[PDB]
Design a protein around this nucleic acid. Structure first.
Ligand code: DGT
Ligand code: MN
Ligand code: MN
Ligand code: MN
Ligand code: MN
Ligand code: MN
Ligand code: MN
Ligand code: MN
Ligand code: NA
Length: 325
DNA sequence: CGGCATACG
DNA sequence: CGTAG
DNA sequence: GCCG
């Protein structure tokens, strides 16, 4: 088992779901306390289990697996022996964890804001609604739409949103294309938003595109909230005899950068952090969603495909459905 | 021990 | 500060 | 919390 998640296939469904979910609770709790190092180890340990070919049934099977030390091994041991890990259950039921999860789920609220509200004594969404003056416009939108934004986005929703984004993109710039990214590109059947990447085959023609797309979507009455090359939107999506709010992210890249943007925006988040970590620490190359830079020669790699990028980095190619780290 | 992704709004 | 994978 |  290789140490970086970008070195191994990780499918969306696997054979250690319960174990991975438990470790991810501890990772999330570490993030709420600002312990990014511990968050990463617990996330990486969970991801290792997702990549295994069969269920872990005995502690012996963890020996030699990367990212499994005393703490993560004890969590697995308790789940194997008793079906529950006391530390995990204590986190789950804790007021701090439950409130930080609720608050950070709000669009416009991060860990730092959630923590400050927690320390002020705030605990519920109605607590926040009862002091609306200390909210940003983004937070007000996130709070107004929070219930709809809690409802899973389904594949049927994705198909409908793609067609309306394409219509607006087509009037904004004939020939521009729309690619589904994020978790749906990795094969998820549900999600909490929809991610799209927009480009044009003629380098430079994409300049100024996103404002034109947004204006057109807004004139069609489809935009409940928006704030350039990245737009974090709330879209009005039709439903039987009504509609629901859906988070949509729209991103534009020039065609020269499209493979890097497609790779970055297809995720998973952990996969991309691991891929960038591998690039820098193992290969001496700096990777982002615009390109791949050699800081010794002072040059950018050209890529025409995701396959090119994996080759540049000396990694076997993984299709999106195997990037579910 | 230091490091832990790397951006844009 | 928020957001993104 | 774990790795190198
Ligand atoms: N309002 C609300 N937001 C939720 C709820 N559950 C999760 N979220 C939000 C918090 C996270 O920012 C986000 C996670 O969404 P997904 O699991 O679809 O993944 P995400 O789109 O971040 O990445 P992905 O595109 O799959 O790589 O959803 C919920 O019950 N209510
Ligand atoms: Mn410990
Ligand atoms: Mn025991
Ligand atoms: Mn997404
Ligand atoms: Mn998104
Ligand atoms: Mn850019
Ligand atoms: Mn996300
Ligand atoms: Mn520590
Ligand atoms: Na949030």
């Amino acid at each position: 088992m290789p140490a970086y998640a970008c070195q191994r296939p990780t499918p969306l469904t696997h054979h250690n779901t319960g174990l991975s979910e438990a470790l991810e609770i501890l990772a999330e709790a570490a993030g709420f306390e600002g312990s990014e190092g511990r968050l990463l180890t617990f996330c990486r340990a969970a991801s290792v289990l997702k990549a295994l070919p069969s269920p872990v049934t005995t502690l012996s099977q963890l020996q030699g697996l990367p990212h499994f030390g005393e703490h993560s091994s004890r969590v697995v041991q308790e789940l194997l022996e008793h079906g529950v890990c006391e530390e995990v259950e204590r986190v789950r039921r804790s007021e701090r964890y439950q409130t930080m999860k609720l608050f950070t789920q709000i669009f416009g609220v991060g860990v730092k804001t959630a923590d400050r509200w927690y320390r002020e004594g705030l605990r519920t969404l109605d607590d926040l609604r009862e002091q609306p003056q200390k909210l940003t416009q983004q937070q007000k939108a996130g709070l107004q739409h929070h219930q709809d934004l809690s409802t899973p986005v389904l594949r049927s929703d994705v198909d409908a949103l793609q067609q309306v984004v394409e219509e607006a993109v087509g009037q904004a710039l004939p020939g521009a294309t729309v690619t589904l990214t994020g978790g749906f590109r990795r094969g998820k059947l549900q999600g909490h938003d929809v991610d799209f990447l927009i480009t044009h085959p003629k380098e430079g023609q994409e300049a100024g595109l996103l404002p034109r797309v947004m204006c057109r979507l807004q004139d069609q009455g489809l935009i409940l909230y928006h704030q350039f090359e990245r737009s974090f939107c709330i879209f009005r999506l039709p439903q039987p005899g009504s509609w629901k709010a859906v988070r949509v992210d729209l991103v534009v890249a020039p065609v020269s950068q499209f493979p890097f943007a497609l790779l970055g925006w297809t995720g998973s988040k952990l996969f991309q952090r691991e891929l960038r970590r591998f690039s820098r620490k193992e290969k001496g190359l700096w990777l982002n969603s615009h390109g791949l830079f050699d800081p010794e020669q002072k040059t950018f790699f050209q890529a025409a495909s995701e396959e090119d990028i994996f080759r540049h980095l000396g990694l076997e190619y993984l299709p999106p459905e195997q990037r579910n780290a």
